[PDB]
Amino acid sequence: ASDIQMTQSPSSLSASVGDRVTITCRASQSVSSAVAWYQQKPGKAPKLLIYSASSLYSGVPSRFSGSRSGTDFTLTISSLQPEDFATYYCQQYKYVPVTFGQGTKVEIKRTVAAPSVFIFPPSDSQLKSGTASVVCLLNNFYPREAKVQWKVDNALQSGNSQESVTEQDSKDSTYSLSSTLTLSKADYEKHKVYACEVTHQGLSSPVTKSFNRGEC
Amino acid sequence: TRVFKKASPNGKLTVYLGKRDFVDHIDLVDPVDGVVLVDPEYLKERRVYVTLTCAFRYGREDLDVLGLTFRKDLFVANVQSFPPAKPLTRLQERLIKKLGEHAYPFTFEIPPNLPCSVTLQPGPEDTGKACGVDYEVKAFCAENLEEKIHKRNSVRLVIRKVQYAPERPGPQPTAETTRQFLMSDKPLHLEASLDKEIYYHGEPISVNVHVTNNTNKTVKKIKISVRQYADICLFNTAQYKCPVAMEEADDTVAPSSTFCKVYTLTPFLANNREKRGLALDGKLKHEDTNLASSTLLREGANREILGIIVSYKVKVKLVVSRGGLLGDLASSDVAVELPFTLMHPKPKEEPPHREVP
Amino acid sequence: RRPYIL
Amino acid sequence: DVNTDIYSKVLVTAVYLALFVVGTVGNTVTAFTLARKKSLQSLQSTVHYHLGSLALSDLLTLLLAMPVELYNFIWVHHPWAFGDAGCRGYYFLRDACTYATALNVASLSVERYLAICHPFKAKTLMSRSRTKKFISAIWLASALLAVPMLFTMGEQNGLVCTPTIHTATVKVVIQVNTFMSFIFPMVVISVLNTIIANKLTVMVFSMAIEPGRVQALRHGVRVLRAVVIAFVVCWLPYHVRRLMFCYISDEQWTPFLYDFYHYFYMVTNALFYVSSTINPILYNLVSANFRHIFLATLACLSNHTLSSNA
Amino acid sequence: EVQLVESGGGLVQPGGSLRLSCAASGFNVYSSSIHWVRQAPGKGLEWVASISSYYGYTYYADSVKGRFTISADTSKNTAYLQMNSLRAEDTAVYYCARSRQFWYSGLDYWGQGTLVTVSSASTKGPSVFPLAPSSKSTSGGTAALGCLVKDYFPEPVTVSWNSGALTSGVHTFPAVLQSSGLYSLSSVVTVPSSSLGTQTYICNVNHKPSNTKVDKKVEPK
Ligand SMILES: COc1ccccc1C1CCN(c2nc(C3(F)CC3)nc3ccc(N(C)CCO)cc23)CC1
């Protein structure tokens, strides 16, 4: 066993309260029943759910169950509660180079809502500092597609764009995307047309918000 | 549903055992149930015998060559399975259903008072198979029992007879001695104890030593040692000792003074690797196994049983130096041995096949 | 007698 | 006025030094060998105690006799260093060491006889503590019956070391010395060794020298007889010479017996020293495990089991 | 009570050294194995080093063997890990986990975790530049306001709008690490346009780890 890859099939999973979901992991080589499952809340230590690929760790609720078929393994959540939103890792421990799964985020789904788009120009003090920061804000979108662009001076800028997505809300259960663009001192004055196109899947057609210098 | 299959070097015979560790409850040992799958076309009206063997492996120091071990049977059982002449088990029924009619079940009853799988720790200069008590399941195609067993049509599978810690805790170990050093001045009292009777592997052993000196002599040092006793009966009944842990403390007790301290020592294999002949637990092939568990024997026991019997004691020793008539070279040591049980608790899964580099 | 040695 | 060739004396000194170094090295490695290491204690075979005691006795004999004996008798004989007290203590130590060697060999023979001829009667009347007490008692008896050497020895006037007691007292002391040093040990060594040899010959056994290991004895008869017929060659000349010291006329009225007795002393002390060297050689020639450990210490100088589902 | 307490994680220079300690409690080092598992920020779990301490074994990852060293101190019931020749890819949150020594695996007990940051950049205070609200381009009913925080190495700042008096569904996106090595986060909030001309929208940024506080005010144009 030079190395064993514990490939988890779903990277992201959307479900609802009371639903039944399954996470399947495939080993690169037979590991016998030496497989464990872990639950990791965001920003916390992982918790052992089941071991031996079928055995339930003491204290873990009976809604969790694991089963082996072949070189593949399965963790089952039956009637998942809201307290099951986490990332789940599969670990084989049959060999010393112990390997985990890539992880599977299990998220609560709901009805799609129309995102809200805003544009914030960089400050004049920032311009006097020799730096530019063109940003646009996406608020309350469910599908998690997003993927905004800029189309600066009818040119699709790419590479230097930075984006950040907040965590799923406890009461809203939606994602907000903040995208930032960094430009040089003379680049902001060179281009007088800016925009932030949204290719979101949550609405019928793409929507582009445009901006120009001297516009409030 | 997990079973072990081992085919013959050619591939005609195949044995199917569910477990590979069979717990020896002191009253009864778990039956060695299995299933042998045969191929009439190759056999040509032969028989398929299945043998359960308990064999004591040993070495010779006379031979010029090294690693040439031997074997010394102490339990042999035979079962003919192809012409079948105690019904099947649920696992046997499932295997028969999944393999059809050319699968023929076998079962073995291991009588009580047989040795458990113990392996003696080999030296670093050794290059052969380890010594100790080893079990084995062997199914082969032979017309006669006495006929030569060509290895091509036989399957050897190693199994382990094991024991687990008794659920009921035992009485707390405790011993005491009084020694007088040819003066009858006053008794030197020593009392030692352990917290519990049954210890698991890797747990600390808490020794509560309590010395009450009334003599006119000084207790120079107090040594606490954990010793392993192995009764090997290969050819003649023997006995062996090996300290698996030791604590040397310079605690001093003055005349007409009392001393109380709790020493904590833990037996483990890391500091005992170079002790050749140390009794370890049974090995499947050559894996790392802990120190041998204590051998549980029936209250009404036949005694003098073959193989290896493992026991553990904690020894506390007071190194008293005589004064007034010598140069302290002499040291009349008073001491105490405390027996305890070192086992594993009852599990819920198979011990081996967890971690391997 | 010659006991020079034993 | 001692007549001896200088070349002969030099050769004797060289042979003595070679035998001394060989015996010291062998007994030291033997002593470190029967250190029992760890986990090698059979708790039923007590030959290690007797073997180590015999090795210590031989090594002490060599160390406490040869350096003093050479420079006092063979190399130079006229002067003396330690005075009368030292010249008496040296003879006392020599007597104690010889007694310890003889009694240790006899005790080893007795223990082996008890183990082999009557194994049923052995464990009942033997133990490790009893063996340790016996080993201590042999040395105690050696010192107790060697103190006559301290009592009779003295320094007259030429730094002679002849005993100061009268001729009758010296003769009686030498008689009891040779008796308790040869006659008692050798009869036991003969009869018990013959009994073991004939009991082994008719048997034509097993020795668990380790947990789960066994060994055999290659020459448990030839060596068992050599340990007898080598103590009539190493002890007998030396003891008969020290008996001919007195109680037999008066030096036979000044014949060449002077040079005869000087050569007697040289040869007899050589044969006495040979016994302190022969023992580890006989130890390596009877036990293979012992030979292996001795040499190692001196060096410091089929398909697969698959899985399926039911 | 069975728990593992970690210590010794922190920011170091690239090529430097570190010594994380896992103070065990409630179990013994000879009846359990101790393993070190790290998680890069926003990544999966990875095993680094493990010590048996009953068989005297120490195992290291394929990228960790030549630099790391795990050890156990039985007297204080503690395990350590000597991290040396640290590079950029060594940044992670390191957990120490317990496993039963005898016939069990699956890490049933974990420590809280200590973040080990390995970068050449140094501590620096933040700077705030307000984001001008767009009263024409935006189509949402409630106008959005926010300010930008950037160029600070220590752990993220805490920006409170109007000292926490603004409760309008404010969002603080997680801080992002830039190429130069300085973090940057943003805080946004949607406020109805009725109170744009009356309600003050002020932000206060506190960076006590770097000891810097900059306050700026945002106003629609
Ligand atoms: C000095 O040798 C003497 C002197 C008097 C009587 C017996 C011996 C024997 C001692 C050594 N050897 C042994 N003989 C026997 C017999 F009794 C059967 C003759 N058993 C042994 C058992 C062990 C052993 N060791 C060297 C210890 C380690 O291996 C030696 C012997 C042969 C001569």
Do residues D98 and D242 lie in contact, with contact meaning Cβ atoms separated by under 8 Å? no
Query: Which among E185, E124, E118 has a CA at the least distance from the CA of E153?
Result: E124
CATH code given to domain D6-297 = 1.20.1070.10
A125 and A77 housed in the same domain: no
A104 and A146 housed in the same domain: no
CB D47 less than 6 A from any atom of ligand 1 = yes
End-to-end, the C-alpha distance of chain B in Å comes to 26
Question: Which of A108, A128, A154 lies at the terminal end of a domain, its last residue?
Answer: A108
Rounded-to-integer distance, Cα A180 and Cα D131, Å: 91
- Residue from D41, D224, D292 whose mutation best tests the ligand 1 pocket (most atoms within 8 A of CB): D224
B93 and B18 housed in the same domain: yes
Rounded-to-integer distance, Cα A101 and Cα A88, Å: 8
| Environment class of A103 (CB within 10 Å of its CB; exposed 0-12, middle 13-18, buried 19+) | buried
CATH number at residue A57: 2.60.40.10
A56 and A94 housed in the same domain: yes
Give residue for tokens 């499947």: B284
| DSSP state for residue A152 in the 8-state scheme | B
Query: Is position A1 within any domain?
Result: no
- Chain A residues in contact with E132 (beta carbon < 8 A): 120-121, 123, 216
CA distance B350 to chain A (A): 10
Query: Is position A89 within any domain?
Result: yes
Do residues A26 and A7 lie in contact, with contact meaning Cβ atoms separated by under 8 Å? yes
Rounded-to-integer distance, Cα B244 and Cα D39, Å: 9
Which atom of ligand 1 lies closest to the CA of D54?
1
Question: Which of A60, A88, A108 lies at the terminal end of a domain, its last residue?
Answer: A108
B143 touches chain E (CB under 8 A): no
Query: Is position B137 within any domain?
Result: yes
Three-state secondary structure string covering E179-190: CCCCEEEEEEEE
Sequence ranges of the domains in chain E: 3-118, 127-217
CA distance B14 to chain E (A): 28
Domain that holds residue A25: 6-108
CB D224 less than 6 A from any atom of ligand 1 = yes
Do residues B130 and B279 lie in contact, with contact meaning Cβ atoms separated by under 8 Å? no
Strands B131-142 and B47-60: antiparallel
Rounded-to-integer distance, Cα E33 and Cα A96, Å: 13
Sheet of strand B205-213, all strands in order from the earlier edge strand to the far edge: B174-179, B188-193, B205-213, B257-265
**What residues pair up with E84 in beta bridges, in sequence order?**
E17
What residue's CA is closest to ligand 1, atom 7? Answer: D109
A126 and A200 housed in the same domain: yes
B26 and B149 housed in the same domain: yes
B296 and B221 housed in the same domain: yes
Query: Which among D233, D52, D250, D236 has a CA at the least distance from the CA of D135?
Result: D52
E and D interact (at least 3 Cβ pairs within 8 A): no
Q: Tell me, yes or no, if the two domains E3-118 and E127-217 fold the same way.
A: yes
B343 annotated as ligand-binding: no
A14 and A102 housed in the same domain: yes
Give residue for tokens 């040692």: B225
List of residues 6+ apart from B73 with CB closer than 8 A: B53, B54, B55, B56
CB D294 less than 6 A from any atom of ligand 1 = no
CB D113 less than 6 A from any atom of ligand 1 = no
Question: Which of B138, B162, B186 lies at the terminal end of a domain, its last residue?
Answer: B162
Do residues B34 and B18 lie in contact, with contact meaning Cβ atoms separated by under 8 Å? yes
The long-range contacts involving B330-335, CB below 8 angstroms and separated by at least 24 positions, are B331/B220, B332/B179, B332/B181, B334/B177, B334/B179, B334/B188, B334/B190, B335/B177, B335/B190
CB D46 less than 6 A from any atom of ligand 1 = no
Rounded alpha-carbon distances, angstroms, from residue E107 to E47, E76, E95: 11, 22, 11
A34 and A68 housed in the same domain: yes
Rounded-to-integer distance, Cα B142 and Cα B144, Å: 6
Query: Which among A7, A29, A93, A97 has a CA at the least distance from the CA of E62?
Result: A97
Q: In this complex, which of D39, D218, D310 lies closest to B95 when CB atoms are compared? A: D310
Sequence ranges of the domains in chain D: 6-297
Question: Which of B117, B132, B162 lies at the terminal end of a domain, its last residue?
Answer: B162
Question: Which of A108, A142, A158 lies at the terminal end of a domain, its last residue?
Answer: A108
Domain that holds residue B153: 4-162
E and C interact (at least 3 Cβ pairs within 8 A): no
**What residues pair up with E17 in beta bridges, in sequence order?**
E84
CB D109 less than 6 A from any atom of ligand 1 = yes
Segment 278-337 of chain B within 8 Å of chain D by CB: 278-279, 308
Q: What are phi and psi of D282, to 5 degrees?
A: -65, -25
- Residue from D46, D53, D206, D287 whose mutation best tests the ligand 1 pocket (most atoms within 8 A of CB): D287
Find the D296 Cα to ligand 1 centroid distance in Å: 20
B333 and B195 housed in the same domain: yes
- Residue from D40, D186, D286, D297 whose mutation best tests the ligand 1 pocket (most atoms within 8 A of CB): D286
Residue burial E146-160, b: 16+ Cβ < 10 Å; e: rest? bbbbbebbbebbebb
E140 touches chain A (CB under 8 A): yes
Task: Assign a CATH topology to domain E3-118.
Answer: Immunoglobulin-like (2.60.40)
CA distance E209 to chain B (A): 43
Tell me the one-letter amino acid at E175. Answer: A
B256 and B140 housed in the same domain: no
Query: Which among E144, E175, E145, E140 has a CA at the least distance from the CA of E158?
Result: E175
Does the domain at E127-217 match CATH 2.60.40.10? Answer given as: yes
CB D103 less than 6 A from any atom of ligand 1 = no
Rounded-to-integer distance, Cα B103 and Cα A21, Å: 40
How many distinct structural domains can be found in chain B?
A: 2
Q: Could you write out the DSSP letters of every residue in A90-119?
A: EEE-SBSS-EEB--EEEEE-------EEEE
Q: In this complex, which of D38, D43, D306 lies closest to B275 when CB atoms are compared? A: D38
CATH number at residue B286: 2.60.40.640
Taken in order D192, D193, D199, D200, the sign of the CA dihedral is positive
Query: Which among A113, A111, A110, A115 has a CA at the least distance from the CA of A206?
Result: A115
| DSSP state for residue D183 in the 8-state scheme | I
**Side-chain half-sphere of E185: how many Cα atoms within 13 Å?**
21
Find the D228 Cα to ligand 1 centroid distance in Å: 13
Segment 61-80 of chain E within 8 Å of chain A by CB: 61-62
A11 and A53 housed in the same domain: yes
- Chain B residues in contact with E104 (beta carbon < 8 A): 354
CB contact under 8 A, A94 and B353: yes
CB D293 less than 6 A from any atom of ligand 1 = no
Strands (DSSP E) contained in B1-46 are 3-7, 14-17, 21-23, 34-37
Do residues B19 and B352 lie in contact, with contact meaning Cβ atoms separated by under 8 Å? no
Q: D158 to chain C: nearest residue by CA?
A: C4
Continuous H helices in chain D: 6-33, 47-69, 83-117, 128-152, 167-178, 184-203, 222-229, 231-234, 236-244, 257-284, 288-298
Q: Which of D9, D88, D157, D162 to mutate to test the interface with C (most CBs of C within 10 A)?
A: D162
B204 and B327 housed in the same domain: yes
B201 and B279 housed in the same domain: yes
C and B interact (at least 3 Cβ pairs within 8 A): no
How many distinct structural domains can be found in chain A?
A: 2
**What residues pair up with B301 in beta bridges, in sequence order?**
none
Find the D283 Cα to ligand 1 centroid distance in Å: 7
Find the D129 Cα to ligand 1 centroid distance in Å: 21
Taken in order A44, A46, A47, A49, the sign of the CA dihedral is positive
Query: Which among D267, D263, D258 has a CA at the least distance from the CA of D236?
Result: D267
Structure token pair of residue D299: 């060096």
CA distance D22 to chain C (A): 27
Find the D220 Cα to ligand 1 centroid distance in Å: 8
Query: Is position B356 within any domain?
Result: no
E210 touches chain A (CB under 8 A): no
Rounded alpha-carbon distances, angstroms, from residue A12 to A91, B341, D188: 18, 51, 93
Find the D286 Cα to ligand 1 centroid distance in Å: 7
B183 annotated as ligand-binding: no
Segment 30-59 of chain E within 8 Å of chain A by CB: 35, 44-47, 50, 59
Strands (DSSP E) contained in chain B are 3-7, 14-17, 21-23, 34-37, 47-60, 70-80, 103-106, 118-120, 131-142, 154-162, 174-179, 188-193, 198-200, 205-213, 218-232, 240-249, 257-265, 279-281, 308-321, 331-343
Query: Residue B281, SS3?
Result: strand
- What number of residues does chain C have? 6
CB contact under 8 A, B357 and A52: no
Question: Which of B142, B162, B182 lies at the terminal end of a domain, its last residue?
Answer: B162
CB contact under 8 A, B354 and E103: yes
Which atom of ligand 1 lies closest to the CA of D115?
17
Q: What are phi and psi of D251, to 5 degrees?
A: 55, 20
A56 and A126 housed in the same domain: no
Structure token pair of residue D239: 């003891």
A99 and A129 housed in the same domain: no
CA distance E25 to chain B (A): 14
CB contact under 8 A, B288 and E32: no
Q: Which of A2, A29, A52, A67 to mutate to test the interface with B (most CBs of B within 10 A)?
A: A52
